Amino acid sequence: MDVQETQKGALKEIQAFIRSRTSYDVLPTSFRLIVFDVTLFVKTSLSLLTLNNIVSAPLWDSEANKFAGLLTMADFVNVIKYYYQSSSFPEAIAEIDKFRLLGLREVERKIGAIPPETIYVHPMHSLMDACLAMSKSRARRIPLIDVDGETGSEMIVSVLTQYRILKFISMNCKETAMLRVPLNQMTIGTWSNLATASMETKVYDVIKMLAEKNISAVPIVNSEGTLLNVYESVDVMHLIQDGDYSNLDLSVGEALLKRPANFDGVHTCRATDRLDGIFDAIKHSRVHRLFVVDENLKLEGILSLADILNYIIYDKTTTPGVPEQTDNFESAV
């Protein structure tokens, strides 16, 4: 059959697989889950995060014994930007440190950046429920919670990321090898209105881009558009770790000098590449997104994990369903 149709058959099969599994099937046999009291200070939060080499944690409300939402880099980024654009004194920004996590969230609700409330799925419910929830919330992660009837307490089992789900699929679906349709004949990814930055762009300006487009990274290009590097929201956390907010005044170039070694690298592919190579890349390295570039590393687009996962779960003749509900939100870096 033709290449297009083979892909469509492959995708039906992965959908079936995704539906058959549970979120719980993605989990390792023995694993760790780090939880934060909502009443922690921010500055304490950044240290624990950095210290544990994680970029996220679910929040726990301990008077209630309820899950209290999910902490991600998007929280800091949105709050930092909100204070930054309305203050005329740079150092005032350092006050964010003295907020409790509960408060930080209140600020996001008052500026309309976090939804009404909490979103999650049962760990023993279909893995596709988790994908659809993430799709409708524009979240990159979703907590697996189960409510205990004896106590009313909600049991946080874990947090599921689109990286881990995609990696789970690449390891259990030989049918990824049958996705050979190239990207340029596909409508997947973002090819216009790209937030980009230069080496001379100040970090506070990247932060604003991060928040405004609600994205997690910003490619760095020179004039004439070649790809040089990337500035992640996580790199921002590291800069402001240990209370040093003047680092936001640094240029991107200056900030990269302060960024640790990253093996793996920055993943690039061409418009003629296809989902199959992307899956083999997913199984042996932590791809957070692929930057689409030409002959001469000229940036033409971005394909991120959400773009791949939303495309996959949306079915016959590619829905269009999909992605629907409150499509900006806090969720979930």
Partner: protein
């Protein structure tokens, strides 16, 4: 069990130790001693991944110094057939 009460046992408070004999509590078993959260950095870059736990030790409190003014408290429990070691960071009071 079934005895739940108040207050502090009379002996221990008032007063006239030395003891009666008062015995020494049991020695520390070796199956304590090791905690699975202690494997530094953690492997294949999952990192959340742990060794399977010793069953006898499901739901025993575990603790560590933070240097940041918060409690660090953990406990491994079983979910369906898999194991969750949740580590919570909490303010005092």
């Amino acid at each position: 069990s079934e005895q739940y009460s108040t207050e502090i046992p009379a002996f221990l408070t008032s007063n006239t130790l030395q003891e009666l004999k008062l015995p020494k509590p049991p020695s520390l078993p070796p199956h304590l001693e090791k905690c699975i959260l202690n494997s530094n950095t953690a492997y294949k870059e999952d990192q959340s991944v742990l060794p399977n736990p010793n069953h006898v030790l499901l739901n025993h409190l575990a603790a560590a110094n933070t240097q940041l003014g918060v409690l660090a408290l953990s406990a491994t429990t079983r979910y369906h057939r898999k194991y969750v070691t949740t580590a919570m960071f909490k303010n005092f009071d």
